[PDB]
Amino acid sequence: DLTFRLLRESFADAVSWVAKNLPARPAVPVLSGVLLTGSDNGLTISGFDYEVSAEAQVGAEIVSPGSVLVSGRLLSDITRALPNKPVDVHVEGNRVALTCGNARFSLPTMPVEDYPTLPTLPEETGLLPAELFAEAISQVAIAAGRDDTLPMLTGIRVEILGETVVLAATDRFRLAVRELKWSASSPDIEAAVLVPAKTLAEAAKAGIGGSDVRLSLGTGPGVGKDGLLGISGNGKRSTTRLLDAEFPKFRQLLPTEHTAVATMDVAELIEAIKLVALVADRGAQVRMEFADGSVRLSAGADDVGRAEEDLVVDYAGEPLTIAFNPTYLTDGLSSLRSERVSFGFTTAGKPALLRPVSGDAVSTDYVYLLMPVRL
Template sequence: MKFRVERDVFADAVAWAARSLPVRPSAPVLAGLLIEAGDEGLVLSSFDYETSARAELSADLEVSGKVLVSGRLLADICRSLPHKPIDFDLNGAKLELKCGSGRFSLQTMPVEDYPSLPTVPPASGVVNGEEFASAVSQAVTAAGRDDMLPVLTGVRIEIEGDRMSLLATDRFRLSHRELTWTPNDTTASLAALVPAKVLSDTAKTLSGDVTISISSAGGEGIIGFEGRSGDGLRRTTTRLLDGEFPKVRSLFPAEHLTVATISKQELIDTVKRVALVAERNTAVQLRFVGDEVILDSQSGDEAQATEAVSADVTGDDLVTGFNPEYLLQGLSAMAGDKVDLSFTQPTKPVVIQATGASENNLFRYLLMPRRLLS
């Protein structure tokens, strides 16, 4: 195998394909990156039996072939190379690469031991890559990070015709994002529970139209994403999470007794300042009174903080409190300049959403209150 490729194009493709390589692979070959040079140009692949990644790019091919080398090492090398073309040459059990005056030689792994990548299911539909990335970044805000509860580490994708819903929860908060897409079957009703990290890493790197493929045939669910990144085609698949995702839609109340409309950035800045003196694992208190929201926090007798934010409050006055980190994460995920905080009563969750948000791209963030210190 022998080829030449532009450094920036190759480094980007290697970084994309190697991003899902396992830190502690169950077999040495799973730490490898498969490089194939042939009629399709250059194809880079990785697979750990859960998630696969495939990057296609163009190169000047002299001799076709395929080779398996350490993916992370290759990514580190490519990242450090000067912005000049790279020449690759497979010489026996070594892959040699030259870039400028630099020379590297990498030990190869047995290609025959590398597993075959899973087959991508038939396409289910297409979504705008930029809108999908934005929706995913909002939805994953509430995804769990506790591997002891794997179902909660995923984002549930629900599809009904041309409507797509993204839902995530860690039991303390809940995110819900709506968007439109173009399904291949307008009558299709699909659902998939996708690992949040894989979904987030994939969505933010794909551009243009992103093709989504969902299958649960044979009892083993798989989802595939295909789009463009940089100068080439990118494709990834991942196994769906097992288990029943909680029925969370009913947690959103049908009506609200108190609604406060507030400047998003002003509220974020105020929460950050007031939370500086909050004791670990304690709530920041919010008092909705008249035309303002008063925030309070304290650290025993050592420090206290109080600050008011102007707000348009309709409904009953109330006092509640929230984990400041969770509150900030929800506010930061909102689009627009103003947000609505909607309540039924102080001991029930707040629903946060951008003021005047369209139903077509609605994002709601539900946050459970925390007990206030007396």
């Protein structure tokens, strides 16, 4: 009942996006599948699990309408490996015929009724330039520390205030808040919700074309407990369930006046961190020793090596000697899309403030809170 024809690249691009974030999974077989729907004008490619859904619609010559359920990872891997010709697709009983140039395929099909029905639209709360979203999330997500660790509730907080968006991501060592200006598709609206880095970042990492990223949480009176978040892009559209966990109240953590402040060249600092960090322990510390006109960046191993570098800086205040985890600090410096950096600390046991200095519930546009280490 289903027959379509489109360009290989378009079909490859559409599937990969629906079959990356959420699939790549064998948990329940009846759900490794991706749904192909042959609407009168285009092909829609659908997919989800129990929480995060994804949908892609692309141009097609659908000769016969209908739908079909085929292996997720497989189709992706196939469409990318196929020739740069058009591809023809026919469903024959419960097998799918797929021809692209001189290559034939036959894939086992799954029953179209077993597949869950996707989530809908939480009404458009507003939109913003995809480049901005790409940056915002890209910055903040550096701080929701999650690598080889168990995924403790790992989320980027998203707050809407009239037309002011605030993105906050933290673990417990670092806190990254970013502010954002918004074409808010509703009157002044207030919304503070939590949605896990995992997916959110990817929708943004898509690195969408233009000013078309479209945040769907509803225009209502706060989006309800229907834990949904829609991202809509140029044809690409994905929902994701939002966590029930509560974010810290970050405004608290941020100081107004800080006992001491200085500024230095980002590039140069990142090169010297990695320089002296080479000798840093498994208890990774790096010692910054602030004085007028200069900082003595040093680190050491309690056994095997010692390192130090004098760097120029514009310091001002009562000298501070303080240490950081070289990786969380360098994450910060990188996070700042700035040539130079503002440092705002209070005590060698109180958070230090990383702000971008591109000279010539938040404070400036990008703010980055870093916990110190002791001795």
